[PDB]
Amino acid sequence: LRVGNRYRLGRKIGSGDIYLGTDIAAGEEVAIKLECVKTKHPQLHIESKIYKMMQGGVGIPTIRWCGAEGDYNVMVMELLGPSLEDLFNFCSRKFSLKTVLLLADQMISRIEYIHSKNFIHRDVKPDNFLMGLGKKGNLVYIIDFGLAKKYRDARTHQHIPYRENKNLTGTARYASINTHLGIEQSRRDDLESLGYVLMYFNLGSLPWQGLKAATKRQKYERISEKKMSTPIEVLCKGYPSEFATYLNFCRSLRFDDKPDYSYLRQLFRNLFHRQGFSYDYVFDWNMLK
Numbered sequence: 462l463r464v465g466n467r468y469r470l471g472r473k474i475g476s477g478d479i480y481l482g483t484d485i486a487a488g489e490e491v492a493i494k495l496e497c498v499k500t501k502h503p504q505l506h507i508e509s510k511i512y513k514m515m516q517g518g519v520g521i522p523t524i525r526w527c528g529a530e531g532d533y534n535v536m537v538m539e540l541l542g543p544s545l546e547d548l549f550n551f552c553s554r555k556f557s558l559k560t561v562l563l564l565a566d567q568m569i570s571r572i573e574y575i576h577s578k579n580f581i582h583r584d585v586k587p588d589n590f591l592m593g594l595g596k597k598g599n600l601v602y603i604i605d606f607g608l609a610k611k612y613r614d615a616r617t618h619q620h621i622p623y624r625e626n627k628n629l630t631g632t633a634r635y636a637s638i639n640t641h642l643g644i645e646q647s648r649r650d651d652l653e654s655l656g657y658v659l660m661y662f663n664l665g666s667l668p669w670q671g672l673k674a675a676t677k678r679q680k681y682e683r684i685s686e687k688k689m690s691t692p693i694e695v696l697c698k699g700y701p702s703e704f705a706t707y708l709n710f711c712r713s714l715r716f717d718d719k720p721d722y723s724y725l726r727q728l729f730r731n732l733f734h735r736q737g738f739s740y741d742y743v744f745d746w747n748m749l750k
């Protein structure tokens with residue numbers, strides 16, 4: 462079907478829904494996200510506004526086209542490759558220290574860029590980072606701005622107020638302690654969540670993963686409690702101290718503190734150099750044959 466002037470829609474990729482497509486005119490594959498014009502909760506146009514504000518940043522996917530066609534609102538992106546969850550599954554849920562550290566360097570940089578554009582992400586998880594294709598295959602991208610919010614006024618740089626008594630909107634596995642306590646999310650929270658993602662890659666799972674409970678809200682209570690009763694030195698036992706030092710620093714941040722991103726990158730860089738690794742972008746999955 463003839464989306465825009467110059468895009469052919471293909472079959473679904475996964476999860477509105479995501480499709481493979483072709484830029485017929487340029488001879489490139491693309492990713493297409495459709496949303497029905499009458500949902501109860503229209504979101505794509507809002508998301509697209511944010512993706513547009515992010516454009517030009519390293520590892521932000523490039524919008525080809527937004528519009529509407531027939532029954533649908535439409536956004537078209539340059540094609541990207543598999544997520545970190547997909548590549549983690551493909552690697553038997555085991556990443557080397559070198560791979561974790563290569564990813565951590567880029568991942569901190571993307572969150573910092575988002576924050577520079579006056580937003581917080583609030584769904585930092587392996588599924589929302591994708592590797593590029595082709596020439597861009599060494600580059601980690603971030604996606605999914607459906608849960609994102611402005612944390613300061615674009616002009617006045619005025620932080621949003623400290624609020625309580627909130628819901629847990631994102632993914633519970635990687636959520637911050639302050640999020641479980643129902644406190645308003647800020648920059649520190651995106652970074653703490655990254656901290657849990659990194660240990661996830663180290664361990665193959667997290668200790669509060671796979672808790673049975675009867676209801677959903679009961680399951681979140683159980684995750685919260687497990688997190689809050691698992692000291693950082695226990696979570697990180699048997700891995701370089703840097704993972705612990707990073708999570709402790711994140712948990713020390715005040716609501717409206719600007720994180721020292723540079724310090725966090727330097728932490729993992731120094732570890733990287735002590736191990737004698739080279740920044741040559743050869744991830745575990747590149748060595749498959």
Ligand SMILES: Fc1ccc(-c2ncn(C3CCCCC3)c2-c2ccnc3[nH]ccc23)cc1
Pocket residue numbers: 474475476479492493494522536537538539540541542544588604
């Ligand atoms: F305009 C957009 C087009 C696609 C997407 C998207 N959402 C989710 N994904 C993937 C689907 C496969 C599982 C992992 C998440 C995409 C997506 C898929 C492929 N290459 C892409 N390039 C940019 C986003 C995206 C988001 C906005």
